[PDB]
């Protein structure tokens, strides 16, 4: 039986009030540069300098990724694996399959925290300032994280971002956050962390929040394309490879592309029910 | 009967607090009832017991 | 009587009641030599280069540490967990060769006492230095509060472990503690000035040892033994819950709950077993510990050993047995990796050095197990190491794959707790009744090469 | 010596009459059926391994005591080995039995392991599963049959021994057998440790060729070994009502008590961190062998904590109690139950699934080897004299107290 079937506990009722998802597609990953950019333009993040990510500690809440192949193909890289023996030279295939071979295949892929369901950086938190809300995301409070490092680990994904030293105003990070004229660019709505709290690449809530906000005030309903042109994680690349927007509102652009043939999450086996899900790349 | 004092504090605290106060989710701990989500109050349940069984007696 | 004539001599040198009690009190009743003030010195002085690396990092950041932005724990609670496994000892020691009527233990249960009262508080420093914001350490009680009455939740085991550690130290301090009244007793009949009068008639209580008051301490002390074992068993289990309880491949598990308690055990006597050796000859008091104390701790070291070895085997038989790539690649790294180096020294001293106690010749020598024992330290050291970061930098998703080195401040909060757990042991050994009077007093006519020779004849 | 009863013959010649008849009755009752009615046809046969891989590592939950005390060198144990010797004469026996059934298994008499099935292995046929012919190096039957061969040697040989030599060492005026013995019980239990922890990979979890788990022989071990113990209790409170065992008091009884007592709260302990690791943290692959328990064996699962741990806590924590006959027997009944029923719930989902009751075929195959372990144990009884002669410990031992 599908995977997705077996569970020992009872789910939570998120057929009514806006659930959320964010769809990748992978053809249309040229290197989806500036999503980066616009990403870490509201949300504060601080720019650390060669040292301090010279030894892998930096701050990025999404990233790209870069995978290439060893012997010209990626399915050169699954008969190898496949073709296997026992012990004498699984210690060797191993070891050459990290040497990637001339000439190989490129590919890409945008890995941010997908807001689970069944969350492992959820159910360890000892001071629980972690919790999901009822649109299905991962709610972060910056004022309860009491900075003993769990749910960096429970992660699989990995996509988990404690600081480290503090960033705000001292000389040892003389960057725009220091100076008096060049923190203009830092907006009022979103808050600016200080030591030993976590942050995490949320789904885009201080747009969320205000679009739901300019739809009650004056009476409708929220149309089709405005959940999409407020985050900007994908009202911003430039091809049509993020797409983000609502579900339970089945006129939209993602629940169209929820229904097809490509459907498909990272890591099902482990069972933590993601809410971002890719398709396929269909290269020939 | 110290011990036996110390499982009622265990487990009215607990009960109180996770199901009757505030039933957030954290994970996809079914916060339901008591029954469900049981076994991780366990650990503390049963160190509580010990802990009143000890030291009232002492 | 009815004792079997197989049975050897616990006490040797004809020694009777006023023999044993000057003996034992005789440290207690003199000055310390200028050894003792070299040694007591240096352990001083490795304390508080260390409190200064503790209070920098503190205040300028955990930043500062060797960890990674993969790998968040190393070093830290690495060394939390092996201090926990060394405050296991005195309590196995105390309590379950009580239950099974060991008589040998008598010479050993007071200082056991001490190497947990003495390493469980450098355990309880590392949940607090690697926190983010210490200051707010505050919030992980229940308490209520101005925040609607905010909680705490009761799922994760870290919050597990707070209760598991506090109860645990809690209930041990009383325990060992009662032990002493009838000790301190035959120090305040001593008061050789009118300091030490007061000093004993205060850490005494009104112990006027009677028909009805030992009928009591007896009970008291089954009780609480009764409770302790499942307190030796439940709280290391608590601390096993932080990696077996993930989804991380390596470390979820069914295997860890009895696999790091059975460890536990194996550093901790061997860890003990050090200290005697050099107890005996400092102290001289080698005629209440003697080889048979030794090598019956060596036996004990050798099963436990056996056990861990089965369990190396058992994890390694279900990894190829599974059909899960990720668990079986984590073993192969553990095996061939970077960090191969860690894990064969691990593997070396915790498969070979138990099974030297098989041959006689080198199990009764307290040359040979004095090296042995302490061998077995840093294997266990490394045996929680591998654990934890051989299976952090290696995971799912490749990309996120990484290394680890950790840096001097790392390093020199380590040297700070070994440097505070010898100051408060030495100092212990010189104003504390090392060796309990009113256990021994009851074994003196029981077993001895004065008692045992007479029924011979 | 030991005077049979003249009367526990024809009793258990009538459990191995009467079981033997419900066993012989048992077996004489699209793509749906093919599912169900291999779980009806596979009723009758788990209700017969069940019931010998029971008795069988009850037999083994005194051996391995037996070889503890007597390396242990207890000073209360001696008076009560020979009891212990003539509860260990089943085992010679009943691993036959237990041999056979493997064999059957083998040779394609029934559809008890999934792993032994036709077309397995080969991919040039419609039953072929991938994951379990990438097992085969381990589940390879010539391979299953002679690693579980040598299993049995291994107990029985130091069974016999044992005996052999102790005997010896009565009808001697120095010693040399026991040192000879206490060698060979450390040998035995370096070599037990190690043949247990396959053993159960073997014999218990090849049920279910698409699960495994850490920590399940440890578990398995405890679900015996606790009512080995108690098996040695009850019939010492027998032999003593009855007048044949002499130096046996209330002492000897209170200790046995609270020792099972003790080691059956550990049999929970293993049983609860199994389950809540799993449960925990619910990854679906290897969860389901626990959904579909509690979805159908509801009572079963549950009903096995209470009898084997909430019953007994309530009861053998009062020190007089301990000291009771009665108590003693009573709480030794329910942990029999109790266990009966762990193996009970390990075997039979894997079987017959949804299709399981507890009617005639499985109470009729628990009644014959119930008359036959009767039979066996009180008939090698008469063979040797309770209360062995010269022993370093036993001076002690009879004038133990508590
Ligand atoms: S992806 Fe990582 S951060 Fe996002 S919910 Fe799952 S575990 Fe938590
Ligand atoms: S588990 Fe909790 S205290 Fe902060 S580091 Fe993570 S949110």
């Given at each position: 039986?599908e995977?997705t079937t077996?569970?020992?506990?009872?789910?939570?009722?998120?057929?009514?009030?806006?659930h959320?998802?964010?769809?990748?597609?992978?053809?249309?990953?040229?290197?989806?540069?500036?999503?980066?950019?616009?990403?870490?333009?509201?949300?504060?993040?601080?720019?650390?300098?060669?040292?301090?990510?010279?030894?892998?500690?930096?701050?990025?809440?999404?990233?790209?990724?870069?995978?290439?192949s060893?012997?010209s193909?990626?399915?050169?890289?699954?008969?190898?694996k496949?073709?296997?023996?026992?012990?004498?030279?699984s210690?060797?295939?191993?070891?050459?399959?990290?040497?990637?071979?001339?000439?190989?295949?490129?590919?890409?892929?945008?890995?941010?925290?997908?807001?689970?369901?069944?969350?492992?950086?959820?159910?360890?938190?000892?001071?629980?300032?972690?919790?999901?809300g009822?649109?299905?995301?991962?709610?972060?409070?910056?004022?309860?994280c009491?900075?003993?490092?769990?749910?960096?680990?429970?992660?699989?994904?990995?996509?988990?971002?404690?600081?480290?030293?503090?960033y705000?105003?001292?000389?040892?990070?003389?960057?725009h956050?220091?100076?008096?004229?060049?923190?203009?660019?830092?907006?009022?709505?979103?808050?600016?962390?200080?030591?030993?709290?976590?942050?995490?690449?949320?789904?885009?809530?201080?747009?969320?929040?205000?679009v739901?906000?300019?739809?009650?005030?004056?009476?409708?309903?929220?149309?089709?394309?405005?959940?999409?042109?407020?985050?900007?994680?994908?009202?911003?690349?430039?091809?049509?490879?993020?797409?983000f927007?609502?579900?339970?509102?089945?006129?939209?652009?993602?629940?169209?592309?929820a229904?097809?043939?490509?459907?498909?999450?990272?890591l099902?086996?482990?069972?933590?029910?993601?809410?971002?899900?890719?398709?396929?790349?269909?290269?020939? | 009967?110290?011990?036996?004092?110390?499982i009622?504090?265990?487990?009215?605290?607990?009960?109180?607090?996770?199901?009757?106060?505030?039933?957030?989710?954290?994970?996809?701990?079914?916060?339901?009832?008591?029954?469900?989500?049981?076994?991780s109050f366990?650990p503390?349940?049963?160190?509580?017991?010990?802990?009143?069984?000890?030291?009232?007696?002492? | 009587?009815?004792?079997?004539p197989?049975?050897?001599?616990?006490?040797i040198?004809?020694?009777?009641?006023?023999?044993?009690?000057?003996?034992?009190?005789?440290?207690?009743?003199?000055?310390?030599?200028?050894?003792?003030?070299?040694?007591?010195?240096?352990?001083?002085?490795?304390?508080?280069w260390?409190?200064?690396?503790?209070?920098?990092?503190?205040?300028?950041?955990?930043?500062?540490?060797?960890?990674?932005?993969?790998?968040?724990?190393?070093?830290?609670?690495?060394?939390?967990?092996?201090?926990?496994?060394?405050?296991?000892?005195?309590?196995?020691?105390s309590?379950?060769?009580?239950?099974?009527?060991?008589?040998?233990?008598?010479?050993?249960?007071?200082?056991?006492?001490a190497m947990?009262?003495?390493?469980?508080?450098?355990?309880?420093?590392?949940?607090?230095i690697?926190?983010?914001?210490?200051?707010?350490?505050?919030?992980?009680?229940?308490?209520?509060?101005?925040?609607?009455?905010?909680w705490?939740?009761?799922?994760?085991?870290?919050?597990?472990?707070?209760?598991?550690?506090?109860?645990?130290?809690?209930?041990?301090?009383?325990?060992?503690?009662?032990?002493?009244?009838?000790?301190?007793?035959?120090?305040?009949?001593?008061?050789?000035?009118?300091?030490?009068?007061?000093?004993?008639?205060?850490?005494?209580?009104?112990?006027?040892?009677?028909?009805?008051?030992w009928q009591?301490?007896?009970?008291?002390?089954?009780?609480?033994?009764?409770?302790?074992?499942?307190?030796?068993?439940?709280?290391?289990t608590?601390?096993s819950?932080?990696?077996?309880?993930?989804?991380?491949?390596?470390?979820?598990?069914?295997?860890?709950?009895?696999?790091?308690?059975?460890?536990?055990?194996?550093?901790?006597?061997?860890?003990?077993?050090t200290?005697?050796?050099?107890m005996?000859?400092?102290?001289?008091?080698?005629?209440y510990?003697?080889?048979?104390?030794?090598?019956?701790?060596?036996?004990?070291?050798?099963?436990?050993?056996?056990?861990?070895?089965?369990?190396?085997?058992?994890?390694?038989?279900?990894?190829?047995?599974?059909?899960?790539?990720?668990?079986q690649?984590?073993?192969?790294?553990?095996?061939?990796?970077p960090?191969?180096?860690?894990?064969?020294?691990m593997?070396?001293?915790?498969?070979?050095?138990?099974?030297?106690?098989?041959?006689?010749?080198?199990?009764?020598?307290?040359?040979?197990?004095?090296?042995?024992?302490?061998?077995?330290?840093?294997?266990?050291?490394?045996?929680?190491?591998?654990?934890?970061?051989?299976?952090?930098?290696?995971?799912?998703?490749?990309?996120?794959?990484?290394?680890?080195?950790?840096?001097?401040?790392?390093i020199?909060?380590?040297?700070?707790?070994?440097?505070?757990f010898?100051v408060?042991?030495?100092?212990?050994?010189?104003?504390?009744?090392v060796?309990?009077?009113?256990?021994?007093k009851?074994?003196?006519?029981?077993?001895?090469?004065?008692?045992?020779?007479?029924?011979?004849? | 010596?030991?005077?049979?009863?003249?009367?526990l013959?024809?009793?258990?010649?009538?459990?191995?009459?009467?079981?033997?008849l419900?066993?012989?009755?048992?077996?004489?009752?699209?793509?749906?059926?093919?599912?169900?009615?291999?779980?009806?046809?596979?009723?009758?046969?788990?209700?017969?391994?069940?019931?010998?891989?029971?008795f069988?590592?009850?037999?083994?939950?005194?051996?391995?005591?037996?070889?503890?005390?007597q390396?242990?060198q207890?000073?209360?144990?001696?008076?009560?080995?020979?009891?212990?010797?003539?509860?260990?004469?089943?085992?010679?026996?009943?691993?036959?039995?237990?041999?056979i059934?493997?064999?059957?298994?083998?040779?394609?008499?029934?559809?008890?392991?999934?792993?032994l099935?036709?077309?397995?292995?080969?991919?040039?046929?419609?039953?072929?599963?991938?994951?379990?012919?990438?097992?085969?190096?381990?589940?390879?039957?010539?391979?299953?049959?002679?690693?579980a061969?040598?299993?049995?040697?291994?107990?029985?040989?130091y069974?016999?021994?044992?005996?052999?030599?102790c005997?010896?060492?009565?009808?001697?005026?120095?010693?040399?057998?026991?040192?000879?013995?206490?060698?060979?019980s450390?040998?035995?239990?370096?070599?037990?440790?190690?043949?247990?922890?396959?053993?159960?990979?073997?014999?218990?979890?090849?049920?279910?060729?698409?699960?495994?788990?850490?920590?399940?022989?440890?578990?398995?071990?405890?679900?015996?070994?606790?009512?080995?113990?108690?098996?040695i209790?009850?019939?010492?409170?027998?032999?003593?009502?009855?007048?044949?065992?002499?130096?046996?008091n209330?002492?000897?009884?209170?200790?046995?008590?609270?020792?099972?007592?003790?080691?059956?709260?550990?049999?929970?302990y293993?049983?609860?961190?199994?389950?809540?690791?799993?449960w925990?943290?619910?990854?679906?692959?290897?969860?389901?062998?626990?959904?579909?328990?509690?979805?159908?064996?509801?009572?079963?699962?549950?009903?096995?904590?209470?009898?084997?741990?909430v019953?007994?806590?309530?009861?053998?924590?009062?020190?007089?109690?301990?000291?009771?006959?009665?108590?003693?027997?009573?709480?030794?009944?329910?942990?029999?139950?109790?266990?009966?029923?762990?193996?009970?719930?390990?075997?039979?989902?894997?079987?017959?699934?949804?299709?399981?009751?507890?009617?005639?075929?499985?109470?009729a195959?628990?009644?014959?080897?119930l008359?036959?372990?009767?039979?066996v144990?009180?008939?090698?009884l008469?063979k040797?004299?309770?209360?062995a002669?010269?022993?370093?410990?036993?001076?002690?031992?009879?004038?133990?107290?508590?």
């Amino acid at each position: 039986v599908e995977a997705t079937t077996v569970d020992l506990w009872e789910s939570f009722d998120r057929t009514t009030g806006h659930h959320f998802n964010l769809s990748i597609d992978l053809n249309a990953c040229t290197g989806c540069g500036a999503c980066v950019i616009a990403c870490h333009a509201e949300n504060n993040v601080p720019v650390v300098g060669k040292a301090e990510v010279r030894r892998s500690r930096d701050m990025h809440w999404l990233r790209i990724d870069r995978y290439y192949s060893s012997e010209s193909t990626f399915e050169g890289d699954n008969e190898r694996k496949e073709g296997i023996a026992g012990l004498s030279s699984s210690l060797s295939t191993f070891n050459e399959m990290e040497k990637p071979g001339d000439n190989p295949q490129v590919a890409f892929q945008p890995v941010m925290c997908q807001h689970c369901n069944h969350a492992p950086c959820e159910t360890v938190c000892p001071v629980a300032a972690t919790s999901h809300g009822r649109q299905g995301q991962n709610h972060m409070a910056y004022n309860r994280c009491v900075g003993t490092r769990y749910c960096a680990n429970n992660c699989p994904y990995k996509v988990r971002r404690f600081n480290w030293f503090l960033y705000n105003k001292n000389s040892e990070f003389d960057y725009h956050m220091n100076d008096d004229l060049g923190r203009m660019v830092l907006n009022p709505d979103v808050n600016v962390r200080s030591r030993g709290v976590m942050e995490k690449c949320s789904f885009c809530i201080q747009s969320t929040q205000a679009v739901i906000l300019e739809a009650k005030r004056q009476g409708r309903v929220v149309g089709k394309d405005e959940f999409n042109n407020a985050c900007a994680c994908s009202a911003a690349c430039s091809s049509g490879a993020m797409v983000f927007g609502d579900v339970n509102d089945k006129e939209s652009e993602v629940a169209k592309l929820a229904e097809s043939e490509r459907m498909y999450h990272l890591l099902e086996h482990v069972g933590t029910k993601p809410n971002v899900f890719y398709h396929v790349k269909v290269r020939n | 009967l110290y011990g036996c004092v110390g499982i009622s504090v265990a487990t009215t605290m607990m009960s109180y607090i996770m199901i009757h106060d505030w039933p957030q989710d954290i994970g996809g701990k079914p916060s339901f009832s008591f029954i469900q989500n049981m076994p991780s109050f366990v650990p503390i349940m049963f160190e509580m017991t010990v802990f009143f069984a000890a030291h009232l007696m002492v | 009587h009815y004792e079997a004539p197989i049975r050897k001599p616990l006490v040797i040198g004809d020694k009777s009641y006023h023999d044993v009690t000057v003996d034992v009190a005789a440290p207690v009743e003199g000055p310390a030599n200028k050894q003792w003030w070299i040694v007591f010195t240096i352990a001083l002085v490795a304390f508080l280069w260390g409190l200064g690396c503790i209070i920098y990092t503190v205040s300028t950041g955990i930043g500062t540490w060797g960890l990674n932005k993969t790998v968040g724990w190393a070093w830290d609670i690495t060394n939390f967990v092996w201090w926990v496994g060394i405050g296991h000892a005195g309590t196995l020691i105390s309590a379950v060769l009580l239950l099974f009527r060991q008589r040998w233990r008598m010479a050993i249960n007071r200082s056991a006492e001490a190497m947990t009262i003495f390493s469980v508080v450098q355990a309880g420093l590392f949940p607090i230095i690697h926190m983010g914001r210490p200051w707010l350490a505050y919030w992980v009680l229940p308490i209520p509060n101005q925040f609607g009455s905010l909680w705490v939740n009761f799922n994760s085991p870290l919050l597990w472990d707070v209760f598991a550690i506090s109860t645990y130290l809690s209930v041990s301090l009383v325990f060992w503690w009662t032990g002493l009244l009838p000790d301190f007793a035959m120090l305040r009949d001593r008061a050789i000035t009118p300091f030490n009068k007061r000093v004993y008639s205060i850490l005494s209580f009104g112990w006027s040892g009677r028909a009805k008051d030992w009928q009591r301490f007896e009970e008291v002390s089954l009780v609480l033994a009764g409770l302790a074992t499942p307190l030796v068993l439940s709280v290391h289990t608590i601390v096993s819950m932080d990696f077996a309880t993930s989804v991380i491949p390596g470390w979820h598990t069914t295997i860890f709950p009895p696999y790091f308690v059975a460890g536990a055990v194996f550093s901790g006597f061997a860890m003990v077993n050090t200290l005697l050796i050099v107890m005996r000859k400092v102290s001289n008091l080698e005629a209440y510990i003697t080889l048979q104390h030794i090598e019956l701790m060596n036996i004990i070291i050798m099963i436990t050993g056996s056990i861990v070895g089965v369990a190396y085997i058992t994890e390694l038989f279900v990894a190829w047995y599974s059909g899960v790539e990720y668990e079986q690649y984590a073993f192969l790294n553990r095996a061939t990796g970077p960090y191969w180096w860690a894990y064969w020294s691990m593997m070396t001293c915790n498969v070979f050095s138990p099974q030297f106690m098989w041959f006689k010749k080198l199990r009764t020598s307290i040359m040979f197990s004095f090296i042995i024992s302490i061998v077995v330290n840093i294997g266990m050291w490394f045996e929680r190491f591998v654990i934890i970061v051989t299976s952090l930098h290696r995971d799912y998703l490749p990309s996120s794959w990484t290394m680890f080195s950790p840096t001097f401040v790392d390093i020199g909060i380590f040297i700070g707790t070994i440097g505070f757990f010898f100051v408060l042991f030495l100092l212990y050994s010189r104003t504390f009744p090392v060796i309990a009077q009113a256990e021994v007093k009851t074994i003196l006519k029981g077993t001895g090469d004065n008692y045992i020779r007479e029924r011979a004849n | 010596m030991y005077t049979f009863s003249s009367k526990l013959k024809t009793f258990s010649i009538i459990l191995m009459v009467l079981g033997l008849l419900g066993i012989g009755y048992g077996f004489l009752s699209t793509e749906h059926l093919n599912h169900v009615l291999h779980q009806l046809q596979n009723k009758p046969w788990s209700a017969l391994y069940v019931a010998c891989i029971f008795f069988l590592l009850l037999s083994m939950g005194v051996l391995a005591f037996y070889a503890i005390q007597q390396v242990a060198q207890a000073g209360w144990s001696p008076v009560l080995f020979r009891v212990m010797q003539g509860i260990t004469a089943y085992l010679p026996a009943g691993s036959i039995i237990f041999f056979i059934i493997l064999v059957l298994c083998g040779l394609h008499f029934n559809h008890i392991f999934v792993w032994l099935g036709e077309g397995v292995t080969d991919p040039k046929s419609p039953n072929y599963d991938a994951i379990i012919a990438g097992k085969s190096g381990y589940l390879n039957f010539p391979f299953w049959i002679v690693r579980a061969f040598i299993f049995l040697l291994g107990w029985n040989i130091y069974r016999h021994f044992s005996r052999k030599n102790c005997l010896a060492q009565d009808e001697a005026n120095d010693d040399l057998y026991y040192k000879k013995n206490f060698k060979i019980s450390a040998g035995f239990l370096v070599f037990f440790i190690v043949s247990e922890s396959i053993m159960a990979w073997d014999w218990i979890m090849s049920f279910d060729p698409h699960w495994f788990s850490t920590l399940f022989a440890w578990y398995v071990f405890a679900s015996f070994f606790v009512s080995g113990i108690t098996s040695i209790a009850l019939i010492t409170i027998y032999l003593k009502s009855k007048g044949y065992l002499e130096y046996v008091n209330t002492s000897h009884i209170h200790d046995l008590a609270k020792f099972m007592f003790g080691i059956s709260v550990f049999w929970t302990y293993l049983w609860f961190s199994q389950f809540m690791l799993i449960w925990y943290a619910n990854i679906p692959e290897e969860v389901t062998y626990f959904v579909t328990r509690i979805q159908l064996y509801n009572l079963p699962f549950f009903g096995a904590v209470v009898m084997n741990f909430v019953f007994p806590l309530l009861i053998l924590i009062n020190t007089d109690f301990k000291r009771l006959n009665w108590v003693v027997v009573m709480a030794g009944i329910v942990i029999l139950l109790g266990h009966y029923v762990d193996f009970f719930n390990m075997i039979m989902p894997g079987t017959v699934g949804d299709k399981w009751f507890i009617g005639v075929p499985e109470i009729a195959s628990i009644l014959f080897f119930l008359g036959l372990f009767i039979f066996v144990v009180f008939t090698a009884l008469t063979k040797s004299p309770l209360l062995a002669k010269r022993n370093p410990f036993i001076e002690e031992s009879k004038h133990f107290h508590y």
